[PDB]
Structures are given as structure tokens and as C-alpha cells.
């Protein structure tokens, strides 16, 4: 059945199998959970220090590579740079904060993202009732959850050299999920994507996010680069 031509839909060609991701769900501990909902559902003036919190916590996995290369000189031959990347996507209401640091495994993820208490959070809630300035959360071993000053929900999508790659989600509410990821690998890092509050869209400002950057995240000893969509 001779053909000089065929239409797009005719060659189109068949699909890859469909990939299983398997997920699980955890309860926050419960003064996580309690914490949690402090953050998210009382006014305080100096909501932008999540950045700071999180660009420590991705400086912090930078330093680790350094360190983790006096036991294991392999990473060494890695030509990933070691660096910070801050995307605003308007269109979509994110903040993502992409790091090649050494990523979480799915273990790290369960544990250090939500499972287990800090000996400081009770503390750090009753400072905060005491009238304490968010800010000091970082001192109180749980910046993380200062995300949630400005995100309703938050991804992070991290790869480790010792395991396959995992999405971590919280829409906060007292749990959170883990779910292999097998969509587009990052490579080795981690990537905190924050879907913004309504009232919080500032942080998608290159003004904004700039301002807030130089004015607590001078140290990070790693270059930080701000992504910028063109207007169109
Ligand atoms: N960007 C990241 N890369 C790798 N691990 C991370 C990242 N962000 C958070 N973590 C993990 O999450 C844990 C909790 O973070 P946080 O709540 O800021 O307390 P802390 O920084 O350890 N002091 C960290 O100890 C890391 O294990
Ligand atoms: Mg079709
Ligand atoms: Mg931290």
C-alpha cells in the first residue's frame, strides 16, 4: 500500500512503558506538626528570612561535597559546579532554590524532613509566644519549616549519590508524602520548589529577591545566581 507522505499522527511513535512511582505518607512528629501550624497561620512582619534558611541549608550540603571528598576522592571528578540557583516562574507562582550539594536520600528525606523531633522546637514555640522574632528559627534547629511563612506547599526533589531520585511534598496539615521520582532527573543536588501564598508573590520580584539576598545571605561562600525570565 504505496505512501509518499504520512501525517504526524500516523508516525507518531508509541509511548515508553508507564513507570510505577511508589509513595508513601508520615505523619510530622508532633510538635513538628504544632510548629508547623504556628508558621502558617500567625502574622509575622519578617517573613522573608525563608530564604536565608533555606540557601544555609543548601550551603550547607555544598560544604558537605568538599568534606565528603576526604573519604571518598571520586567526587573530586565530578564537573558539576558547586553553586545556588534561584528561579521565579510567575506563570506558575513558584520559588524554586536548586543546589548541587549532596542531595537527600529517600531515608534522609523521612527522617530529617519531618519524622524525627529537634530538642529545640518546643523551646522555639514558646519563645515565639513569649514575642520572639522569627528570625531566630535558624538557632532553634528547624529552619526548614520556614518555608511555610510564604509557601503553601513545598516540593523538594533531591538526588544523592547513594540512591535514586525522591520527591518529598507537604501541603502542611500534619503529614507529608515521599514518591520516587522518575521524571527529569536533576542530577545530584536538591531542588526546594515553593508554591507561593497569594499575598506572597513579592518573592517572585528580581528586586525582591535580590534585596533579600544581600541583606542576610552575604556569607554562602558559593556562587548564587538569580534566573531571570525575559518579559515578554
Ligand atoms: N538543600 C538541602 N540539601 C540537603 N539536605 C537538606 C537541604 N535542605 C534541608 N536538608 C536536610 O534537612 C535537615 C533539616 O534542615 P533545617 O530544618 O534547616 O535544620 P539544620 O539546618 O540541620 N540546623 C538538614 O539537616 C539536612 O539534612
Ligand atoms: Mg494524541
Ligand atoms: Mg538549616
Redesign the pocket.
Known amino acids: 500500500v504505496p505512501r509518499g507522505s504520512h501525517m504526524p499522527e500516523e508516525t507518531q511513535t508509541q509511548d515508553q512503558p508507564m513507570e510505577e512511582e511508589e509513595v508513601e505518607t508520615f505523619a510530622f512528629q508532633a510538635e513538628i506538626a504544632q510548629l508547623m501550624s504556628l508558621i502558617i497561620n500567625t502574622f509575622y512582619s519578617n517573613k522573608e528570612i525563608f530564604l536565608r ?2 540557601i ?3 550551603s ?2 555544598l560544604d558537605k561535597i568538599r568534606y565528603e571528598s576526604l573519604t571518598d576522592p571520586s567526587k573530586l571528578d565530578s564537573g558539576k559546579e558547586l553553586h545556588i540557583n534561584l528561579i521565579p516562574n510567575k506563570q506558575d507562582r513558584t520559588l524554586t ?1 536548586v ?1 548541587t ?4 536520600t529517600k531515608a ?1 528525606l523521612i527522617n ?2 519531618g519524622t524525627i523531633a ?1 530538642s529545640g522546637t518546643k523551646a522555639f514555640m514558646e519563645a515565639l509566644q513569649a514575642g520572639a522574632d522569627i528570625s531566630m528559627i ?1 538557632q532553634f ?5 520556614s518555608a511555610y511563612l510564604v509557601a503553601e506547599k513545598v516540593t ?1 526533589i ?1 538526588k544523592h549519590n547513594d540512591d535514586e531520585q525522591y520527591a518529598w511534598e507537604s501541603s502542611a496539615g500534619g503529614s507529608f508524602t515521599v514518591r520516587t521520582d522518575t521524571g527529569e532527573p536533576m542530577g545530584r ?2 531542588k ?1 520548589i515553593l508554591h507561593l501564598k497569594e499575598d506572597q508573590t513579592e518573592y517572585l520580584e528580581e528586586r525582591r529577591i535580590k534585596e533579600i539576598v544581600k541583606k542576610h545571605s552575604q556569607f554562602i561562600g558559593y556562587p548564587i545566581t538569580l534566573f531571570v525570565e525575559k518579559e515578554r
Not at 101 to 104: C, D, E, F, K, R
Not at 141 to 145: D, S
Open positions: 534558611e533555606l544555609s541549608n543548601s550547607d550540603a532554590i543546589d550539594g549532596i542531595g537527600m534522609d530529617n524532613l529537634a535558624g534547629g528547624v529552619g526548614f519549616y523538594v533531591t543536588g536538591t526546594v
